[PDB]
Short mmCIF file of C-alpha atoms in Angstrom, two decimals:
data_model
loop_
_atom_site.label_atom_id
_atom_site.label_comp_id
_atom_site.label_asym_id
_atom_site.label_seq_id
_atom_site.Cartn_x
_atom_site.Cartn_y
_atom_site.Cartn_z
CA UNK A 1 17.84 -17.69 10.54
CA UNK A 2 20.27 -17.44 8.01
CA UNK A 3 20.26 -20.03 4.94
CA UNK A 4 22.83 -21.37 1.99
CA UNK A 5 21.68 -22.36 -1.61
CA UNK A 6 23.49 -23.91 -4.50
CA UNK A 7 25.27 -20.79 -6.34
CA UNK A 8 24.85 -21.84 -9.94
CA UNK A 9 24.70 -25.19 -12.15
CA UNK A 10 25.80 -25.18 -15.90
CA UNK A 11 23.69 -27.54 -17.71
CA UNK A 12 22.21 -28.22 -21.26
CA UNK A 13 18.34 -28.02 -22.47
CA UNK A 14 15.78 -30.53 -21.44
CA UNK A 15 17.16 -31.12 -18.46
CA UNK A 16 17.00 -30.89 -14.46
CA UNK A 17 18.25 -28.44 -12.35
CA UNK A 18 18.92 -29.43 -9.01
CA UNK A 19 18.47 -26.52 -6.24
CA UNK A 20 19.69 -27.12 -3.33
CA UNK A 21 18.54 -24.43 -0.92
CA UNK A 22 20.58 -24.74 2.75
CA UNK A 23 19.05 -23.41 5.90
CA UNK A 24 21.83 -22.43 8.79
CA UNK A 25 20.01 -23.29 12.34
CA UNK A 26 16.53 -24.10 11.76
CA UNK A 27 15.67 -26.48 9.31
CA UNK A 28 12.16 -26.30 7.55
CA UNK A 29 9.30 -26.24 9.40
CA UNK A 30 7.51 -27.35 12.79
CA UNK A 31 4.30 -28.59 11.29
CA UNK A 32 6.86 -30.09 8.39
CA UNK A 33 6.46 -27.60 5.93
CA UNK A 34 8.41 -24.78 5.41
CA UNK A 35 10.69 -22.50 3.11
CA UNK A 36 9.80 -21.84 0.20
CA UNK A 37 11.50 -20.96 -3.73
CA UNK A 38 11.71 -17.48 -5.74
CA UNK A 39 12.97 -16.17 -8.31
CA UNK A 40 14.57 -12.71 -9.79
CA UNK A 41 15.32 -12.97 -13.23
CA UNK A 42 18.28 -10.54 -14.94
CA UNK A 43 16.93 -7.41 -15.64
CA UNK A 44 13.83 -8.25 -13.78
CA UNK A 45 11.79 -7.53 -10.92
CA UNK A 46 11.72 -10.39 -8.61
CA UNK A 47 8.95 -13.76 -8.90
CA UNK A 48 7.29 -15.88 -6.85
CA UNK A 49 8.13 -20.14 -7.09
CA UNK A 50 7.41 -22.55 -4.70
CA UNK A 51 6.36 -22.38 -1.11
CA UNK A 52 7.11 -24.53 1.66
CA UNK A 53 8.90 -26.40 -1.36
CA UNK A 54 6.25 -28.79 -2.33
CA UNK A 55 3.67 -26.73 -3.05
CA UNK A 56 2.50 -23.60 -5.25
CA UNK A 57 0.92 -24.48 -8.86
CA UNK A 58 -0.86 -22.92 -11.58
CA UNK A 59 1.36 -19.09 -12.11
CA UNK A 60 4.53 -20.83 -11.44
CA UNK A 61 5.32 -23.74 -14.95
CA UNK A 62 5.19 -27.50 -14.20
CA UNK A 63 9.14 -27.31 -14.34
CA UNK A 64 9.35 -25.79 -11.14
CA UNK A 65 9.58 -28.46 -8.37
CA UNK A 66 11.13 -30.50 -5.94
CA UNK A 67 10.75 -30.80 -2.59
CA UNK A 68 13.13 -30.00 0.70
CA UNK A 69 14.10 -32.35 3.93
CA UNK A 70 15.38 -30.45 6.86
CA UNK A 71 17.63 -27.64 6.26
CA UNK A 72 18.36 -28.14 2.69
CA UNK A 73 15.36 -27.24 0.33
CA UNK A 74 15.51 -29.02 -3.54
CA UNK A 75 14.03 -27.03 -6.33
CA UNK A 76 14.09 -29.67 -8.99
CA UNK A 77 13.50 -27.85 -12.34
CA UNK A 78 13.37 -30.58 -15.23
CA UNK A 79 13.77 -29.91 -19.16
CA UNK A 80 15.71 -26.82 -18.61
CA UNK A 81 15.00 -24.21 -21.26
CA UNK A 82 17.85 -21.78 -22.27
CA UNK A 83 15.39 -18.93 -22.19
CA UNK A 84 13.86 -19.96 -18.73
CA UNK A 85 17.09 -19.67 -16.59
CA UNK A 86 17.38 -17.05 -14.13
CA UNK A 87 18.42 -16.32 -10.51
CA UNK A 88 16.19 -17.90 -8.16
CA UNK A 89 15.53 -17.59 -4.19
CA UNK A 90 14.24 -19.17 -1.37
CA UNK A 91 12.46 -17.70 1.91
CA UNK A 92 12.57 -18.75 5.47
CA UNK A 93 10.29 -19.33 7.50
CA UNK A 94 9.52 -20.00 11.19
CA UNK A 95 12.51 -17.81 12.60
CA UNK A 96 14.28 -14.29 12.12
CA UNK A 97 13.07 -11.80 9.16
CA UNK A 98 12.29 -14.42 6.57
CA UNK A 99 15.19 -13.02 3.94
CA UNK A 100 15.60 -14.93 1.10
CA UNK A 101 18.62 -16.66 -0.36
CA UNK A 102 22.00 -15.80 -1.70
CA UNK A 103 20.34 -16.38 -4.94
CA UNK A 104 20.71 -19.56 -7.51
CA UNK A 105 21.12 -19.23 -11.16
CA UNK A 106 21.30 -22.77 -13.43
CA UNK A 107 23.15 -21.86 -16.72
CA UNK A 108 22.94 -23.12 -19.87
CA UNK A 109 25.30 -24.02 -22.39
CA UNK A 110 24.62 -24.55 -26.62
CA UNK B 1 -24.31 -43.94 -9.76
CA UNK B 2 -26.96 -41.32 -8.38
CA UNK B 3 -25.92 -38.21 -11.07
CA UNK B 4 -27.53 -38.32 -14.53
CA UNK B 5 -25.55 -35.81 -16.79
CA UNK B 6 -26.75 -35.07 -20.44
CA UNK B 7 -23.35 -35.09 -21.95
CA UNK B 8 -20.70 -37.86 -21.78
CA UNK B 9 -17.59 -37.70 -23.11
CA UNK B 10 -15.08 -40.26 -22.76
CA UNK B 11 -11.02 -39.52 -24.29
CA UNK B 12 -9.04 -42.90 -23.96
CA UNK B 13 -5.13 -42.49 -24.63
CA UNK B 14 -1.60 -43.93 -23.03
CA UNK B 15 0.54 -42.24 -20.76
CA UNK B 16 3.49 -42.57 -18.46
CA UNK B 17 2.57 -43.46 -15.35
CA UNK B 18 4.76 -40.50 -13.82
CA UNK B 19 2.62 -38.43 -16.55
CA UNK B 20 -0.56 -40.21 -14.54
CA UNK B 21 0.00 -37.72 -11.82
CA UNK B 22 0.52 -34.90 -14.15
CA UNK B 23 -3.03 -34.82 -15.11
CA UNK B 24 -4.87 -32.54 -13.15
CA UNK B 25 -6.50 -29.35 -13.81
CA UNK B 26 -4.06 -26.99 -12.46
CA UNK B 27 -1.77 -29.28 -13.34
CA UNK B 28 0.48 -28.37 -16.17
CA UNK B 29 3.25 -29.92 -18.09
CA UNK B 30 4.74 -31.60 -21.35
CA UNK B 31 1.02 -33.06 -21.49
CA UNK B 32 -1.30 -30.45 -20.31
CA UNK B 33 0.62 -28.28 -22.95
CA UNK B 34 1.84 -29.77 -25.90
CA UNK B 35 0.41 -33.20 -26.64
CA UNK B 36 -3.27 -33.31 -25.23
CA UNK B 37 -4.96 -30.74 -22.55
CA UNK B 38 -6.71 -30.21 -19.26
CA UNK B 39 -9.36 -27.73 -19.10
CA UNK B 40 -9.06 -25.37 -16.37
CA UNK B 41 -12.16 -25.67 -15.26
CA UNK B 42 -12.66 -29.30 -15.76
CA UNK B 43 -14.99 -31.24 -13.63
CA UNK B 44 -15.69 -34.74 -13.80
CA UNK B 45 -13.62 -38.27 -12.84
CA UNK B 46 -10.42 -39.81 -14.72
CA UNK B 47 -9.73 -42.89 -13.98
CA UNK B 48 -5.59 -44.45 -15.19
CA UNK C 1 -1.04 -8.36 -8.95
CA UNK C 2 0.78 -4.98 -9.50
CA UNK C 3 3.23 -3.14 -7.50
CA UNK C 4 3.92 0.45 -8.88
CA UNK C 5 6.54 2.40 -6.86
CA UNK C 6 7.74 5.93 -6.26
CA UNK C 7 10.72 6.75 -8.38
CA UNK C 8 14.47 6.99 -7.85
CA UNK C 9 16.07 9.04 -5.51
CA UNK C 10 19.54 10.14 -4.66
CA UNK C 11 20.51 11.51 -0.87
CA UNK C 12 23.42 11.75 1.21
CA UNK C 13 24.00 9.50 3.97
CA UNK C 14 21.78 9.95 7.07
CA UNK C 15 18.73 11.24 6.24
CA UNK C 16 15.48 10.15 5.34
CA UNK C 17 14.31 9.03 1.63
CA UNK C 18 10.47 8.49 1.52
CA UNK C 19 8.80 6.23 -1.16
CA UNK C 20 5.60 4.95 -1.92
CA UNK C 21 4.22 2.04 -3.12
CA UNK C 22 1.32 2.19 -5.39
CA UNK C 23 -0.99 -0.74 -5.66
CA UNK C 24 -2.51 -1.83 -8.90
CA UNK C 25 -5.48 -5.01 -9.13
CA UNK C 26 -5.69 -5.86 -5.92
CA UNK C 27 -7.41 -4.68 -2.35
CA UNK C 28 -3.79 -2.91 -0.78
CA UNK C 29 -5.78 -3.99 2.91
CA UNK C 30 -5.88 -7.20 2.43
CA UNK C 31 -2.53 -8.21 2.23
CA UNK C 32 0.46 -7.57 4.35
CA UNK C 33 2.88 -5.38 2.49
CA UNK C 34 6.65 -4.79 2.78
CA UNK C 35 9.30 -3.20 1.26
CA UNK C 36 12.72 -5.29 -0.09
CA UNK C 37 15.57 -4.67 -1.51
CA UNK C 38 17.44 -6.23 -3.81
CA UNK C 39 21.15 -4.49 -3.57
CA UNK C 40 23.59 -4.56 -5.65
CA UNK C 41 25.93 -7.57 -6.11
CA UNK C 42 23.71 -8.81 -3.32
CA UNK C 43 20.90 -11.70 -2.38
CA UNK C 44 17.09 -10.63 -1.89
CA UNK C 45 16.95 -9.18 1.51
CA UNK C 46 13.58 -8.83 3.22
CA UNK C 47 13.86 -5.50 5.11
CA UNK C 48 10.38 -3.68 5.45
CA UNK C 49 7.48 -4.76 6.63
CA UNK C 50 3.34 -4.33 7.14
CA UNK C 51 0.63 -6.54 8.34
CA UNK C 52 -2.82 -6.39 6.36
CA UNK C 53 -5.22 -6.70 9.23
CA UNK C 54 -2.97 -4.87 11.49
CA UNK C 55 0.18 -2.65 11.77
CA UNK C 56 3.28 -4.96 11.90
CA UNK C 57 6.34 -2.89 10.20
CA UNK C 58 9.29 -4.91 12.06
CA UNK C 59 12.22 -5.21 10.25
CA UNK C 60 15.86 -7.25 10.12
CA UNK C 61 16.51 -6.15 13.64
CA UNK C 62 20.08 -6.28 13.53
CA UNK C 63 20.89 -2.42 11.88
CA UNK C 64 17.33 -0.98 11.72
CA UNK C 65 16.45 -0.25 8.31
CA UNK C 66 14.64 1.95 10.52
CA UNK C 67 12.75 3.13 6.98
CA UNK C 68 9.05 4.71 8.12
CA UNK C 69 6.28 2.45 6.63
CA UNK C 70 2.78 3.51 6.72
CA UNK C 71 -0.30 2.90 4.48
CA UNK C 72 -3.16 4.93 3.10
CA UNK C 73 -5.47 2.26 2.15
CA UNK C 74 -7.69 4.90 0.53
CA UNK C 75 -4.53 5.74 -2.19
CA UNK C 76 -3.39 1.94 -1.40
CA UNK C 77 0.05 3.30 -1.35
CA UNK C 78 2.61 1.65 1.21
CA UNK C 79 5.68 4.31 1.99
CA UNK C 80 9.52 3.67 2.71
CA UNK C 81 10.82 6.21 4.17
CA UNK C 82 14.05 5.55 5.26
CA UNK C 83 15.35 6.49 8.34
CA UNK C 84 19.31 6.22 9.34
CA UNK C 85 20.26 6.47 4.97
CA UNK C 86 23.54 5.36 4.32
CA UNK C 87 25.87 4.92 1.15
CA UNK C 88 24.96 0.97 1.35
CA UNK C 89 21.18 2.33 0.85
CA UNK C 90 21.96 2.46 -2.82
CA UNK C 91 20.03 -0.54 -3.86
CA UNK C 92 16.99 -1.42 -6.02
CA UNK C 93 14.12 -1.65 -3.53
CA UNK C 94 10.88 -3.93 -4.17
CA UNK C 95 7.83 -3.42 -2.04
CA UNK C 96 6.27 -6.63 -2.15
CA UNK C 97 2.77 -8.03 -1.40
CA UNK C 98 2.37 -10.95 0.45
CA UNK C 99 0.08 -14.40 -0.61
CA UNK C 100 -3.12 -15.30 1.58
CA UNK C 101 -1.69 -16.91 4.80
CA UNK C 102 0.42 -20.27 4.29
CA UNK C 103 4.00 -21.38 4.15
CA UNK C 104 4.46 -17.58 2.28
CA UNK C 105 4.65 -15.98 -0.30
CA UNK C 106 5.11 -12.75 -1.95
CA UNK C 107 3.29 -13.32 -5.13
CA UNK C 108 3.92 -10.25 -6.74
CA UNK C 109 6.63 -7.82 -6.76
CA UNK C 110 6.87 -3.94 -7.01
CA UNK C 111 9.45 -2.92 -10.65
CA UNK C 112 11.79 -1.74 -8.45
CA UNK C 113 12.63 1.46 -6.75
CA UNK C 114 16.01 2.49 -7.99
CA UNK C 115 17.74 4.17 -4.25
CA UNK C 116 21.52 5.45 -4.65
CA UNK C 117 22.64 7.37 -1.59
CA UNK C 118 26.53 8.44 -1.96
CA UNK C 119 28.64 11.54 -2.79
#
């Protein structure tokens, strides 16, 4: 369909970032897992995060995670890095060309 | 009970139980990088 | 693993810009492919498409992209070629490569294929 995710955050090192991406009509997955997480970073070609939300691994840093319920999908990054933030994306699934999302960058301050 | 192995090693340490889950080969994190490893091809039981 | 593209290109509106899409480390057959773009000022939008066992090439229906995808799996090089260019076409496009089958992905990503149709 069409989905929503949190804009931006402005936060401090060693920290979480809480992603919040927001799915318009259908929400998740049939079979209970769906979505998924991305990333594009400034300057950069676009990257691969987390699938169906809960999932991916090894290629994509132990900071990357979270989960999703429904609609909204939560890319939980903890101990934020202030060389490690960059716009990030999620894909549908399920329904309609899978786009991505308006994109989600978590700043960092000091 | 029914596997003989030459080698035995056995590494004994503390962690945080939410670290517990963390260790994993695959499975990276503070732990797997900084303060003790997983090998990536690891084989063999851990028991927390 | 690598994406290599074909390089920029600047039309006018209407026409039709080819690429290509070069693939580097992996087997280009199997695994989907697709073309996206990542426009200015904009979200990641999946446009293009391709299956790997099959030909799939369907798009965001809603304006065609329209853009001619076809593969050579002998040069491993997916095309765009995009049909109905306009002055949004200016963009930078990724052709991107799909996981094994699951809740995705596109693992990796093409560098971009800088696309600016205008006067």
């Amino acid at each position: 369909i069409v989905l929503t995710q949190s804009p931006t955050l402005s936060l401090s090192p060693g920290e979480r970032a809480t992603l919040s991406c927001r799915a318009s009509e259908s929400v998740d997955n049939y079979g209970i897992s769906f979505m998924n997480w991305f990333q594009q970073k400034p300057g950069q070609a676009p990257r691969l995060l987390i699938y169906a939300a809960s999932n991916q691994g090894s290629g994509i840093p132990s900071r990357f995670s979270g989960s999703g319920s429904g609609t909204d999908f939560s890319l939980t990054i903890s101990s934020l890095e202030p060389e490690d933030f960059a716009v990030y994306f999620c894909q549908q699934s399920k329904e309609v060309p899978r786009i991505f999302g308006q994109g989600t960058k978590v700043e960092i301050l000091k | 009970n029914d596997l003989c192995f030459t080698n035995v090693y056995a590494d004994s340490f503390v962690i945080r139980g939410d670290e517990v889950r963390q260790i994993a080969p695959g499975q990276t994190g503070k732990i797997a990088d900084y303060n003790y490893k997983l090998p990536d091809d690891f084989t063999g039981c851990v028991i927390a | 693993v690598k994406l290599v593209e074909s390089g920029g290109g600047l039309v006018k509106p209407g026409g039709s810009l080819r690429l290509s899409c070069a693939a580097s480390g992996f087997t280009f057959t199997n695994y989907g492919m697709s073309w996206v773009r990542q426009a200015p000022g904009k979200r990641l939008e999946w446009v293009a498409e391709i299956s790997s066992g099959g030909s799939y090439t369907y798009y965001p229906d809603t304006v065609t992209g329209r853009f001619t995808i076809s593969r050579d799996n002998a040069k491993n090089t997916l095309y765009l070629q995009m049909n109905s260019l306009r002055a949004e076409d200016t963009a930078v496009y990724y052709c991107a490569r799909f996981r094994y089958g699951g809740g995705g992905t596109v693992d990796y990503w093409g560098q971009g294929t800088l696309v600016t149709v205008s006067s």
